[PDB]
Paper text:
[name] has been shown to play an important role in EET but is unusual in containing three CXXCH heme binding motifs that are separated by repeated (PT)x motifs, suggested to enhance binding to mineral surfaces. The amino acid sequence of [name] contains a cleavable Sec signal peptide followed by an N‐terminal lipid anchor and four domains interspersed by repeated (PT)x motifs. The first domain is not predicted to contain any cofactors, while the other three domains are monoheme domains (Fernandes et al., 2023). Furthermore, we demonstrate a distinct role for its domain III as a mineral reductase that is recharged by domains I and II. These findings show [name] to be the first of a new class of electron transfer proteins, with redox centers separated by some nanometers but tethered together by flexible linkers, facilitating electron transfer through a tethered diffusion mechanism rather than a fixed, closely packed electron transfer chain.
The 1.9 Å crystal structure of heme domain III was composed of [name] residues 444–511 and is significantly different from those of domains I and II. First, the coordination of the iron atom within the c‐type heme is bis‐His (His459 and His491), as commonly observed in multiheme cytochromes. Second, no acidic side chain is observed near the distal ligating histidine residue. Domain III contains only three α‐helices despite its molecular weight being ~1 kDa larger than those of the preceding two domains. In fact, a greater fraction of its polypeptide chain forms loops that likely possess greater flexibility when unrestricted by crystallization. This crystal structure also shows that 33% of the total surface area of the c‐type heme moiety is solvent exposed, which is substantially larger than the 25% exposure of the hemes in domains I and II. The domain III spectrum is a small g max, rhombic type LS signal (g max 3.08) typical of bis‐histidine coordinated hemes with near parallel ligand orientation. Domains I and II specifically displayed much greater pH dependence, while domain III only shifted by ~10 mV, which is surprising considering the higher solvent accessibility of the domain III heme. We observed that triheme [name] and domain III bind to akageneite with similar affinity, while neither domains I or II bind at all. While these experiments cannot distinguish between inter‐ and intra‐[name] electron transfer pathways, these observations show clearly that domain III directly reduces iron(III) oxides, while domains I and II are able to recharge domain III for further electron transfer.
Numbering used by the authors: 3 to 72, 76 to 80
Amino acid sequence: GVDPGKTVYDSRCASCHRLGTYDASGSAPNLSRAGTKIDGKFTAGVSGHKGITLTAADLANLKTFVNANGSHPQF
Ligand code: HEC
Ligand code: NA
Ligand code: NA
């Protein structure tokens, strides 16, 4: 789940959000430890937040990515 979750985060939330030290640029909240807020903010297949629609697989993969990476290329 971790790699497709990165694609979800990268293309769909990073433009605004931050995530630990992996992504420290953006004005919206840092999504570190936001799994429960993500699942409350999004319903699988229902268009919502910022025009985004997420599949069930998207939501699971993204949370696995947030848990595993939420960081420096040399660490
Ligand atoms: C800019 C167009 C954004 C995009 C792209 C994403 N998010 Fe967002 N998010 C944005 C703002 C300005 C805010 C604060 C106002 C609000 O609507 O809450 C948020 C907030 C969240 C939250 C809740 C934050 C908290 O309670 O601390 C969550 C859980 C969240 N956003 C999730 C989220 C996800 C999973 C995204 C990728 C699919 C995503 N956002 C994109 C702005 C923007
Ligand atoms: Na960002
Ligand atoms: Na949900």
